[PDB]
Write an enzyme that holds these catalytic residues in place. Structure first.
Site, PDB file in Angstrom:
ATOM      1  N   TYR A   1     -36.396 -12.544 -18.281  1.00 11.50           N
ATOM      2  CA  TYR A   1     -37.102 -11.293 -18.632  1.00 11.50           C
ATOM      3  C   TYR A   1     -37.290 -10.876 -20.127  1.00 11.50           C
ATOM      4  CZ  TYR A   1     -32.204  -9.198 -17.382  1.00 11.50           C
ATOM      5  OH  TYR A   1     -30.936  -8.745 -17.218  1.00 11.50           O
TER       6      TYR A   1
ATOM      7  N   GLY B   1     -36.416  -8.456 -23.064  1.00 12.79           N
ATOM      8  CA  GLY B   1     -37.232  -7.386 -23.646  1.00 12.79           C
ATOM      9  C   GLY B   1     -38.202  -6.740 -22.662  1.00 12.79           C
TER      10      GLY B   1
ATOM     11  N   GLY C   1     -40.337  -8.381 -19.488  1.00 15.03           N
ATOM     12  CA  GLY C   1     -40.734  -8.644 -18.111  1.00 15.03           C
ATOM     13  C   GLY C   1     -39.624  -8.735 -17.046  1.00 15.03           C
TER      14      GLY C   1
ATOM     15  N   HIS D   1     -30.942  -3.932 -23.281  1.00 11.44           N
ATOM     16  CA  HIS D   1     -32.188  -3.274 -23.818  1.00 11.44           C
ATOM     17  C   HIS D   1     -33.135  -3.033 -22.583  1.00 11.44           C
ATOM     18  CE1 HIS D   1     -35.146  -2.042 -26.916  1.00 11.44           C
ATOM     19  NE2 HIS D   1     -34.045  -1.377 -27.344  1.00 11.44           N
ATOM     20  N   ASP D   2     -32.641  -2.072 -21.802  1.00 11.18           N
ATOM     21  CA  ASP D   2     -32.974  -1.753 -20.416  1.00 11.18           C
ATOM     22  C   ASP D   2     -31.764  -0.795 -20.033  1.00 11.18           C
ATOM     23  OD1 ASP D   2     -35.292  -3.454 -19.627  1.00 11.18           O
ATOM     24  OD2 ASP D   2     -33.885  -4.929 -18.562  1.00 11.18           O
TER      25      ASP D   2
ATOM     26  N   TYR E   1     -31.516   1.322 -22.819  1.00  7.12           N
ATOM     27  CA  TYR E   1     -32.906   1.699 -23.249  1.00  7.12           C
ATOM     28  C   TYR E   1     -33.398   2.921 -22.452  1.00  7.12           C
ATOM     29  CZ  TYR E   1     -37.280   0.390 -25.885  1.00  7.12           C
ATOM     30  OH  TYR E   1     -38.159   0.224 -26.901  1.00  7.12           O
TER      31      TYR E   1
ATOM     32  N   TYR F   1     -38.834   5.659 -34.196  1.00  4.93           N
ATOM     33  CA  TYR F   1     -39.247   4.761 -35.281  1.00  4.93           C
ATOM     34  C   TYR F   1     -39.977   5.388 -36.482  1.00  4.93           C
ATOM     35  CZ  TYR F   1     -36.541   1.104 -34.274  1.00  4.93           C
ATOM     36  OH  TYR F   1     -35.411   0.386 -34.072  1.00  4.93           O
TER      37      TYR F   1
ATOM     38  N   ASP G   1     -32.623  -0.072 -30.009  1.00  4.75           N
ATOM     39  CA  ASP G   1     -33.720  -0.890 -30.593  1.00  4.75           C
ATOM     40  C   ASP G   1     -33.246  -1.797 -31.749  1.00  4.75           C
ATOM     41  OD1 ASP G   1     -36.515  -0.169 -29.174  1.00  4.75           O
ATOM     42  OD2 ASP G   1     -35.681   1.874 -29.794  1.00  4.75           O
TER      43      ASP G   1
HETATM   44 CA   LIG Z   1     -35.919  -6.921 -19.928  1.00  5.33          CA
END
Ligand SMILES: [Ca+2]
Length: 124
Positions: A28, A30, A32, A48-49, A52, A73, A99
């Site tokens: 996956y 980041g 998908g 990072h999920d 996140y 950001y 991030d």
């Molecule tokens: Ca992911």
């Protein structure tokens, strides 16, 4: 933010696509896929999920809109290394901390650029 941490991820990597080197990588990375990772490098994409999301729940941010990819950001980049924001509550700066410590997993980690592209069978 994801598109906004990405521009500095492709400085983090001398580099090109900030994801797609990650979207399809193991399971996956980041973007998908779904489930659990493969690499040390893919573990900062399980989280990072997992750190996140929690912008949705937040001490500083709890309403409608910001769920998977959006808040922060206002950055930089040097050699490869950036900063994150120049404003802060937790809303932006908490999301910026996952991030940028993912630009540190994603530039560097115990990396392997090797199981890119995958399939999710062998891989996930
Ligand atoms: Ca992911």
């Amino acid at each position: 933010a994801l598109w906004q941490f990405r521009s500095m991820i492709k400085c983090a990597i001398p580099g090109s696509h900030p994801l797609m080197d990650f979207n399809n990588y193991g399971c996956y990375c980041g973007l998908g896929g779904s489930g659990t990772p493969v690499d040390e490098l893919d573990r900062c994409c399980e989280t990072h999920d997992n750190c996140y999301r929690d912008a949705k729940n937040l001490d500083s941010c709890k309403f409608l809109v910001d769920n998977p990819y959006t808040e922060s950001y206002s950055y930089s980049c040097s050699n490869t290394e950036i900063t994150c924001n120049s404003k802060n509550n937790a809303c932006e700066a908490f999301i910026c901390n996952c991030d940028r410590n993912a630009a540190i997993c994603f530039s560097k980690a115990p990396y392997n650029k090797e199981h890119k592209n995958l399939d999710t069978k062998k891989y996930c």
